Amino acid sequence: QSLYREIHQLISFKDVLPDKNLLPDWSSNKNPCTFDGVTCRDDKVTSIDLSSKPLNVGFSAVSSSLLSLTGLESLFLSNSHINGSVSGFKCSASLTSLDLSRNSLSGPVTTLTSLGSCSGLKFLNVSSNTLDFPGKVSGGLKLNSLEVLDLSANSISGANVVGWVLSDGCGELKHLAISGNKISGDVDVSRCVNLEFLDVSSNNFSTGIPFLGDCSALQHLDISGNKLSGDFSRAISTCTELKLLNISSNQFVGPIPPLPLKSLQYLSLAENKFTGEIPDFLSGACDTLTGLDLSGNHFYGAVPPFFGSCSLLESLALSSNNFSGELPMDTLLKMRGLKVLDLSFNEFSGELPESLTNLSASLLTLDLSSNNFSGPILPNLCQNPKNTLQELYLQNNGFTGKIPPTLSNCSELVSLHLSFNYLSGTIPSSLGSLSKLRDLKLWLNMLEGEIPQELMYVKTLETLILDFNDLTGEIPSGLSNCTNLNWISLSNNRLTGEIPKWIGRLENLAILKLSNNSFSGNIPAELGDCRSLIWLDLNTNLFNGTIPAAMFKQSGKIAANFIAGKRYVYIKNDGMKKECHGAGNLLEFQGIRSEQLNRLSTRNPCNITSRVYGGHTSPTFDNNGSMMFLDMSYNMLSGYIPKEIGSMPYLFILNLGHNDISGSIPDEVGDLRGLNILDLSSNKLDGRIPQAMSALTMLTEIDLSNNNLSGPIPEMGQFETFPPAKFLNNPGLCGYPLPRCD
Numbered sequence: 057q058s059l060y061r062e063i064h065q066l067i068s069f070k071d072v073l074p075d076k077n078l079l080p081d082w083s084s085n086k087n088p089c090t091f092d093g094v095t096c097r098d099d100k101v102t103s104i105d106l107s108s109k110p111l112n113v114g115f116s117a118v119s120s121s122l123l124s125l126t127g128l129e130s131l132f133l134s135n136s137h138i139n140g141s142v143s144g145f146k147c148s149a150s151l152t153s154l155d156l157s158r159n160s161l162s163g164p165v166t167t168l169t170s171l172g173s174c175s176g177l178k179f180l181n182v183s184s185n186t187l188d189f190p191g192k193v194s195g196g197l198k199l200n201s202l203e204v205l206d207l208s209a210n211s212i213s214g215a216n217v218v219g220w221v222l223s224d225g226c227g228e229l230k231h232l233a234i235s236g237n238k239i240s241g242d243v244d245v246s247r248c249v250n251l252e253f254l255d256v257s258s259n260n261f262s263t264g265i266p267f268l269g270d271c272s273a274l275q276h277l278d279i280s281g282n283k284l285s286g287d288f289s290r291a292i293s294t295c296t297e298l299k300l301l302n303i304s305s306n307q308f309v310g311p312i313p314p315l316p317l318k319s320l321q322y323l324s325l326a327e328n329k330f331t332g333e334i335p336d337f338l339s340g341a342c343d344t345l346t347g348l349d350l351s352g353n354h355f356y357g358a359v360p361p362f363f364g365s366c367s368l369l370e371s372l373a374l375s376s377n378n379f380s381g382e383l384p385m386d387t388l389l390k391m392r393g394l395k396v397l398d399l400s401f402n403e404f405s406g407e408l409p410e411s412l413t414n415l416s417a418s419l420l421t422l423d424l425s426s427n428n429f430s431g432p433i434l435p436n437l438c439q440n441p442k443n444t445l446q447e448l449y450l451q452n453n454g455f456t457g458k459i460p461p462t463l464s465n466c467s468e469l470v471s472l473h474l475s476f477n478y479l480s481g482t483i484p485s486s487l488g489s490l491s492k493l494r495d496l497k498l499w500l501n502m503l504e505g506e507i508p509q510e511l512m513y514v515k516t517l518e519t520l521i522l523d524f525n526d527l528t529g530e531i532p533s534g535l536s537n538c539t540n541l542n543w544i545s546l547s548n549n550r551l552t553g554e555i556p557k558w559i560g561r562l563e564n565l566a567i568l569k570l571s572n573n574s575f576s577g578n579i580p581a582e583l584g585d586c587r588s589l590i591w592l593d594l595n596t597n598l599f600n601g602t603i604p605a606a607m608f609k610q611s612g613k614i615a616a617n618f619i620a621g622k623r624y625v626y627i628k629n630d631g632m633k634k635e636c637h638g639a640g641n642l643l644e645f646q647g648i649r650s651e652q653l654n655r656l657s658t659r660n661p662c663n664i665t666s667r668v669y670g671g672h673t674s675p676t677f678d679n680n681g682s683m684m685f686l687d688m689s690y691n692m693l694s695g696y697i698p699k700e701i702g703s704m705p706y707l708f709i710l711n712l713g714h715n716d717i718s719g720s721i722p723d724e725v726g727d728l729r730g731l732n733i734l735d736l737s738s739n740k741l742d743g744r745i746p747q748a749m750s751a752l753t754m755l756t757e758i759d760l761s762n763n764n765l766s767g768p769i770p771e772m773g774q775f776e777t778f779p780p781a782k783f784l785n786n787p788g789l790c791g792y793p794l795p796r797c798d
């Protein structure tokens with residue numbers, strides 16, 4: 057046996073794969089110690105790693121072939137497209153680690169009890185599978201030799217499952233993760249005297265806090281992501297060695313209870329309902345504290361002063377509370393090690409004390425957004441050379457004055473967010489010297505001047521958001537270089553010129569919003585060479601010419617992906633203030649408060665109060681793909697609607713109102729089976745509403761008023777839902793909701 061067995065066992069596995077090419081250098085009459093994925097010691101196989109290879113075989117193929125291999129010590133099959141479920145099998149006494157994570161194992165978690173045939177198994181990872189819990193609890197896992205067990209991200213829903221895992225003993229257990237399930241009930245790890253790591257986060261625990269007993273070895277405790285309301289302080293009081301405590305995203309209330317700080321490195325109480333003010337007793341942790349997160353509560357007060365002793369604190373998150381007072385920098389500068397600072401969403405007032413520039417060479421993220429500050433953006437900022445700052449967020453404050461050009465000295469800057477302020481002046485050209493910047497956001501300020509040509513010197517830029525400023529001039533040609541741009545927005549400015557034809561060279565452009573400006577010219581067919589475009593808002597401009605049929609070629613071959621994951625707001629235009637134009641205004645909204653959109657009142661006649669949608673971007677498709685949004689109302693368009701208009705299936709919205717468009721509504725509009733909004737009012741359209749539109753099943757708003765249209769209204773579909781107003785000022789038109797055809 058020995059070799060003969062080793063090779064015949066491995067090739068038998070290979071020979072059951074559906075794609076034997078996945079193990080190309082495995083072969084007969086050749087030593088396995090030369091195989092990719094194999095590890096050998098002294099010419100004997102000791103480990104097999106076939107992770108991230110789509111083997112597409114059942115576990116039964118693994119147990120008989122690989123797990124029975126004599127002398128095998130570890131098997132790694134993570135993300136290897138193994139399905140089926142565990143059953144009994146001869147398991148060599150040498151196997152100590154099995155990793156079956158990110159696979160499709162199924163069935164009750166009681167299947168795992170048969171892994172007890174591996175007398176030496178100490179590390180089991182079956183996370184990110186689909187194991188469920190038998191409706192009823194019974195027996196135990198009965199793998200009481202394990203030191204490490206990860207059951208996370210399965211489909212386990214039940215009560216006292218934790219009790220089940222540990223029923224028959226846990227003396228040896230050192231690491232237990234069960235996050236990402238729907239487990240509820242009680243957690244009693246008091247008999248697991250060696251437990252050092254407990255992750256019961258993102259579960260369905262809503263009763264009591266886990267019982268930890270002596271807690272004489274616990275170093276990592278993560279109970280975040282539940283609905284826990286209780287007295288965790290009592291439960292963790294005896295925990296002498298705790299290094300990390302994450303209780304975020306729960307239902308905890310009240311002031312900060314006492315804690316064991318003698319070894320605490322990370323502490324998060326975020327996303328609860330704690331009240332009060334940072335107690336002084338927390339100073340005892342500054343000897344060891346590396347990360348603090350108090351964000352998302354109801355705390356108040358000012359950054360207490362003892363934080364100077366927190367020399368080790370690498371990150372301070374205090375956002376979304378009721379903190380106040382000038383920047384307590386008298387303390388911050390003592391934080392030699394601080395690298396992330398986040399005071400956003402408080403009421404820290406006053407100006408920026410000039411001594412900030414020192415901390416700009418140790419920090420990597422500075423977030424003062426959505427506060428009450430006022431005063432100039434310190435020009436001397438980033439004077440201390442070797443400025444490592446990567447992100448600057450000062451939006452939604454009371455900051456006034458010119459945009460400092462010194463900001464070009466933060467050579468490592470990747471995101472600059474100064475929106476929602478009262479910043480006057482021009483946009484510094486030195487920002488072009490920010491060779492790594494990806495996000496420039498300065499909308500709703502008082503920024504005069506033209507858009508710097510020097511932005512061509514930024515080969516990384518991705519987003520350029522400058523709405524609601526006093527910008528003037530034309531679109532700088534230099535942006536043809538920013539190949540990676542995916543989100544340009546210049547609305548509510550006084551820009552002029554024409555949409556440059558080189559707009560098509562940006563194969564990453566997903567969003568282009570240019571409303572309430574003084575642009576002009578025929579719309580460019582080149583926009584049809586934008587393979588990422590899903591959002592094109594051109595309303596309230598002076599464009600003219602007819603509509604290029606060629607701007608709809610990419611429909612069907614779009615893949616929107618670069619765009620997903622950014623906080624936004626969509627403001628639906630109410631059909632009330634005729635002074636307000638467009639379907640709606642989509643706007644980036646990272647770090648700004650929804651409660652400050654009223655600042656637009658003096659800049660926009662739209663009654664925003666009614667409609668404000670938001671969230672984080674989540675494109676609907678991935679391949680396939682087509683434009684989702686398309687607004688061009690309140691321009692000087694004319695000619696006939698190209699029948700290519702109806703080639704965008706994922707299209708939600710379509711506004712072509714208040715123009716000079718004629719011809720007959722193409723019968724392709726009925727093909728837009730995702731259409732929720734359709735505006736074509738105030739035009740010169742003739743013909744009949746194509747009965748093909750009766751196939752539109754998702755129309756929530758339609759408007760065809762003020763045209764030369766004639767004939768019947770489709771009695772099928774949704775046209776009977778809509779009111780006469782949406783069909784008025786069309787003499788020939790008849791049919792309910794209009795009068796019957798005489």
Ligand SMILES: *[C@@H]1O[C@H](CO)[C@@H](O[C@@H]2O[C@H](CO)[C@@H](O[C@@H]3O[C@H](CO)[C@@H](O)[C@H](O[C@H]4O[C@H](CO)[C@@H](O)[C@H](O)[C@@H]4O)[C@@H]3O)[C@H](O)[C@H]2NC(C)=O)[C@H](O)[C@H]1NC(C)=O
Pocket residue numbers: 134157158181182183184204205206231
């Ligand atoms: C059970 O298996 C699962 C699935 O493998 C496993 O969960 C995964 O753990 C890894 C780390 O072990 C996670 O990936 C890490 O994630 C963060 C960013 O999210 C990074 O810190 C890590 O990158 C570091 O390491 C890289 C090389 O190793 C470096 O290039 C890099 O600079 C960083 O230093 C790393 O990517 C992963 O997200 C999870 N979850 C998944 C994949 O769903 C789990 O740990 C296993 N359990 C046990 C007990 O081993």
Ligand SMILES: *[C@@H]1O[C@H](CO)[C@@H](O[C@@H]2O[C@H](CO)[C@@H](O[C@@H]3O[C@H](CO)[C@@H](O)[C@H](O)[C@@H]3O)[C@H](O)[C@H]2NC(C)=O)[C@H](O)[C@H]1NC(C)=O
Pocket residue numbers: 238240260262
């Ligand atoms: C997370 O845990 C909570 C409580 O720990 C679970 O909520 C409870 O779920 C049960 C099981 O479905 C509900 O029972 C059902 O209730 C109604 C009457 O309320 C009745 O029609 C059914 O016969 C059934 O017994 C129970 O009401 C519910 N209790 C609550 C919400 O207070 C919850 O389901 C768990 N999972 C999730 C995903 O939240």
Ligand SMILES: *[C@@H]1O[C@H](CO)[C@@H](O[C@@H]2O[C@H](CO)[C@@H](O[C@@H]3O[C@H](CO)[C@@H](O)[C@H](O)[C@@H]3O)[C@H](O)[C@H]2NC(C)=O)[C@H](O)[C@H]1NC(C)=O
Pocket residue numbers: 257258278280281302304305322324327
């Ligand atoms: C402390 O606890 C918090 C809350 O549990 C941890 O933040 C959480 O981090 C996880 C990944 O570890 C995030 O999960 C992912 O989230 C998205 C939803 O946005 C989802 O698509 C994925 O399925 C995935 O689960 C989770 O969002 C995030 N939660 C929050 C509120 O930010 C944090 O990492 C913990 N820190 C430590 C040091 O333990």
Ligand SMILES: *[C@@H]1O[C@H](CO)[C@@H](O[C@@H]2O[C@H](CO)[C@@H](O[C@@H]3O[C@H](CO)[C@@H](O)[C@H](O)[C@@H]3O)[C@H](O)[C@H]2NC(C)=O)[C@H](O)[C@H]1NC(C)=O
Pocket residue numbers: 548549572596635636637657658659660661662
């Ligand atoms: C296109 O952009 C321009 C410039 O932002 C908008 O003009 C300005 O619009 C706002 C919104 O209504 C006006 O503010 C209002 O002013 C009056 C008195 O001035 C006051 O009673 C209201 O409470 C409100 O503050 C602003 O005056 C107005 N002025 C000028 C001179 O342009 C325009 O409305 C935008 N159009 C669209 C459709 O968004």
Ligand SMILES: *[C@@H]1O[C@H](CO[C@@H]2O[C@@H](C)[C@@H](O)[C@@H](O)[C@@H]2O)[C@@H](O[C@@H]2O[C@H](CO)[C@@H](O)[C@H](O)[C@H]2NC(C)=O)[C@H](O)[C@H]1NC(C)=O
Pocket residue numbers: 576577578598599600601602692
């Ligand atoms: C589209 O408009 C351009 C530009 O005209 C100017 O801007 C318009 C929005 C409108 O306000 C006009 O009164 C402006 O003059 C037209 O191109 C020429 O524009 C020049 C002035 O720049 C004018 O002397 C010419 O007569 C215009 N037209 C021609 C054929 O020479 C353009 O014609 C307009 N229409 C189309 C279909 O392109």
Ligand SMILES: CC(C)[C@@H](C)[C@@H](O)[C@H](O)[C@@H](C)[C@H]1CC[C@H]2[C@@H]3COC(=O)[C@H]4C[C@H](O)[C@H](O)C[C@]4(C)[C@H]3CC[C@]12C
Pocket residue numbers: 624626628640642669673674675676708709732733756
């Ligand atoms: C790509 C991303 C940057 C992001 C914009 C999208 O990913 C976003 O999520 C989408 C799919 C959102 C934004 C605005 C929302 C519309 C609100 O404006 C209405 O008036 C209603 C009317 C009606 O309620 C119907 O549901 C549709 C519609 C147009 C809403 C639909 C979903 C939205 C379209």
Ligand SMILES: *[C@@H]1O[C@H](CO)[C@@H](O[C@@H]2O[C@H](CO)[C@@H](O)[C@H](O)[C@H]2NC(C)=O)[C@H](O)[C@H]1NC(C)=O
Pocket residue numbers: 074112113114139140
């Ligand atoms: C495990 O996964 C495989 C696919 O990876 C499943 O087998 C396939 O089942 C479909 C059903 O139509 C067939 O068309 C495929 O040809 C099958 N694959 C083959 C024969 O290689 C299998 O059913 C899954 N389930 C289990 C329990 O293993």
Ligand SMILES: *[C@@H]1O[C@H](CO)[C@@H](O[C@@H]2O[C@H](CO)[C@@H](O)[C@H](O)[C@H]2NC(C)=O)[C@H](O)[C@H]1NC(C)=O
Pocket residue numbers: 356357378379380403
């Ligand atoms: C908590 O937020 C409240 C508002 O909800 C703040 O109240 C105002 O704070 C300013 C600060 O300059 C005072 O001038 C106002 O007088 C306060 N309002 C009232 C009605 O008195 C408050 O500052 C925050 N609380 C703390 C403790 O910082």
Ligand SMILES: *[C@@H]1O[C@H](CO)[C@@H](O[C@@H]2O[C@H](CO)[C@@H](O)[C@H](O)[C@H]2NC(C)=O)[C@H](O)[C@H]1NC(C)=O
Pocket residue numbers: 464465466467489
């Ligand atoms: C950081 O700021 C300093 C001071 O403003 C800059 O130093 C000057 O840089 C310019 C660049 O053209 C040189 O011509 C000057 O000679 C420099 N100073 C002196 C005294 O000669 C420095 O360039 C900035 N660094 C950046 C933006 O990376």
Ligand SMILES: *[C@@H]1O[C@H](CO)[C@@H](O[C@@H]2O[C@H](CO)[C@@H](O)[C@H](O)[C@H]2NC(C)=O)[C@H](O)[C@H]1NC(C)=O
Pocket residue numbers: 512513533534536537
């Ligand atoms: C920015 O774009 C311009 C064109 O708009 C680039 O001009 C290039 O010049 C080089 C020689 O320096 C030529 O080989 C290229 O053909 C030109 N065009 C392109 C698209 O590369 C300019 O180099 C670009 N770069 C910067 C830093 O401005």
Ligand SMILES: *[C@@H]1O[C@H](CO)[C@@H](O)[C@H](O)[C@H]1NC(C)=O
Pocket residue numbers: 403405428429430454
């Ligand atoms: C915010 O700043 C303004 C002046 O800009 C001041 O009147 C106000 O009291 C400050 N505090 C709050 C909580 O808004």
Ligand SMILES: *[C@@H]1O[C@H](CO)[C@@H](O)[C@H](O)[C@H]1NC(C)=O
Pocket residue numbers: 630632633663665666
């Ligand atoms: C604007 O919003 C207010 C909020 O109360 C609403 O009552 C009012 O009718 C709206 N006005 C228009 C013109 O839409």
